[PDB]
Amino acid sequence: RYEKLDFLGEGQFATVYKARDKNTNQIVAIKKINRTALREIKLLQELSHPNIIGLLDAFSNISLVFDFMETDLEVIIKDNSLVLTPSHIKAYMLMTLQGLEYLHQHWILHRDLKPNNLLLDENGVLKLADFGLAKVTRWYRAPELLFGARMYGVGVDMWAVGCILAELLLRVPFLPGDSDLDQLTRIFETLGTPTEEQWPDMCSLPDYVTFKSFPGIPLHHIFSAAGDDLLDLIQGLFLFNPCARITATQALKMKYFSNRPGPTPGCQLPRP
Ligand SMILES: CC(C)c1cnn2c(NCc3ccccc3-n3cccn3)nc(O[C@@H]3CCCNC3)nc12
């Protein structure tokens, strides 16, 4: 029922192809990989937010149809020819946080936030992807997960948002750990080792271990081109206590989003 146009990329997780719609000639992408599946599929079809990937139709052979996107935030970040102005970063952050807020309001965690999961269309609209039921990521992993927490919440997605913000500002991954232990070392060397005051109940985590006491590097020295409003946003996203860490609604109300300059409109966002 769909007209296969091109080959975008393949993997054991999903087989992605570029295709055209046979009802309204709209270019869409298809991910080819049941009563229990329909329960999750109809819930995903019921979701509707401009900054969240839309599930238009499905196919028995597990085939899912979503809107077509040009690139993701990873392609943009790696493009040396592209220049990310403060207004460009603010636009990507506003869209990411607006999409995350919708998911959290509907009790859905992304669980895998990273640049290649924030996709962009021809009109400069960011949409989150890869969050519906499981049928490199260590760099964006929150410290509670690295200490083996089995029960977790919104802080897991919020920490990853801070890592994406830091990657837009530095143009390289913020904390590129070589292992789960090195990831915790990089977090503590950079942000400081948390105390029982900063993170109460840290010692009760399943894989809790005592690290060397690091003072940390002041956020203003790390992000030398950031203003005080942006430094406050970064500080809230990287609080050690998962309960104290800023939520998507709290982040959207920060003075950063209401201050000048404003976000770059979609049509003016850089395209590769
Ligand atoms: C998430 C859904 C299934 C979707 C929608 N659109 N879409 C594209 N669009 C093309 C694209 C996006 C991001 C980066 C590169 C491309 N691209 C490939 C060729 C030309 N542009 N690629 C992939 O998935 C692909 C293949 C699997 C890895 N991610 C990109 N998945 C999709």
Side-chain angles (χ1 to χ4, degrees), residues 21-40:
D21 183 24
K22 282 195 176 175
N23 309 79
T24 46
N25 288 341
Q26 295 165 291
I27 303 108
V28 292
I30 305 166
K31 245 189 181 182
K32 287 187 180 175
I33 319 296
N34 190 13
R35 308 176 180 188
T36 72
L38 288 172
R39 298 153 202 201
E40 278 254 11

Side-chain angles (χ1 to χ4, degrees), residues 8-9 16 29 31 66-72 75 119 129:
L8 300 166
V16 188
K31 245 189 181 182
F66 307 93
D67 313 291
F68 181 75
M69 316 296 280
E70 323 273 301
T71 53
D72 50 49
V75 168
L119 313 171

